[PDB]
């Protein structure tokens, strides 16, 4: 799949930063995008992130109608990369 | 439509309070459930609220498949009532 990290960061800024700026989670600080939280909840994979972005979960909206498959693959790759590098912001 | 306020408050607690506790908006503080904001954005009517709950908007998830139409009508009635009276919490 698509794994354009820089484009993923753009998708992230346009669609995810409202709730996950800097890798946080303003709606649920127990479920951030930080490595330990992704690991805790089985979310440290492209497949898991793609599914949740596409379909939504709980208070997280779905993005499948607004974003292309490549947009979602890119943002998933961006999230996982940032979690491995330690987020900033 | 259904206008069971106390049931609407239960729907609100289970589905909306993660983001709108006390009539606020943790994601976008310019778009709270306070009367002045609902009035400003044309959201101070039952159908405006039911439509946005049903379809989602921006970072707000959709609920149209997860809640019955009466649940959505009840939560809209609760939101309007609380907004007009003044929220607590
Ligand atoms: C606020 C309305 C959000 C938007 C915009 C985005 N996300 Fe989200 N995210 C939000 C919540 C409330 C949760 C927890 C959902 C639940 O009940 O389980 C999440 C969770 C995630 C996760 C998992 C994090 C973890 O388990 O620790 C990921 C990987 C994630 N969100 C990614 C993500 C993306 C890539 C977004 C933009 C397309 C995005 N989220 C937006 C709230 C919100
Ligand atoms: C966090 C993930 C949210 C959940 C859960 C609920 N809402 Fe929401 N709401 C949220 C956002 C980010 C916004 C702004 C959307 C935009 O881009 O315009 C809203 C907005 C509303 C409004 C309008 C408020 C206003 O115009 O001032 C209403 C009436 C509203 N939300 C109601 C509502 C209901 C009843 C919910 C539970 C079913 C609900 N919201 C959940 C974020 C979130």
Numbering used by the authors:
A (entry chain B), B (entry chain A): -1 to 87
Copy out sentences from the published article reporting this entry, exactly as the authors wrote them.
Cyt c6 is a small, water-soluble protein (~12 kDa) that contains a heme group as its active center. As an essential electron carrier, Cyt c6 mediates between the cytochrome b6f complex and photosystem I (PSI), enabling electron transfer that is fundamental for sustaining photosynthesis by maintaining the continuous flow of electrons through the photosynthetic chain. The crystal structures of Cyt c6 from both species revealed a conserved fold, consisting of five α-helices, a bound heme group, and loop regions, which closely resembled previously characterized Cyt c6 proteins from other species. The heme was covalently linked to two cysteine residues via thioether bonds, and the central iron atom was axially coordinated by methionine and histidine residues, maintaining consistent coordination geometry in both oxidized and reduced states.
The reduced Cyt c6 proteins were generated using β-mercaptoethanol, while oxidized forms were prepared by adding potassium ferricyanide. Minimal differences were observed between the reduced and oxidized forms, with an RMSD of 0.446, indicating that heme coordination remains stable throughout redox transitions, consistent with the previous report. Structural comparisons between red-Cyt c6-7942 and oxi-Cyt c6-7942 revealed some differences in surface amino acids, particularly charged residues, despite the largely similar positions of heme-binding pocket residues. However, noticeable differences in the surface potential map are observed near the acidic patch (Asp68, Asp69, Asp72, and Asp2 in Cyt c6-7942), which can be attributed to the flexibility of the N-terminus. Additionally, the oxidized and reduced forms of Cyt c6-7942 exhibited highly consistent dimeric interactions. Small structural differences between red-Cyt c6-7942 and oxi-Cyt c6-7942 suggest insights into the functional mechanism of photosynthetic electron transfer. In contrast, the oxidized form undergoes structural adjustments to accommodate the oxidized heme, providing the flexibility required for efficient electron transfer and subsequent dissociation from PSI. This rapid structural transition may facilitate flexible and effective electron transfer through Cyt c6.
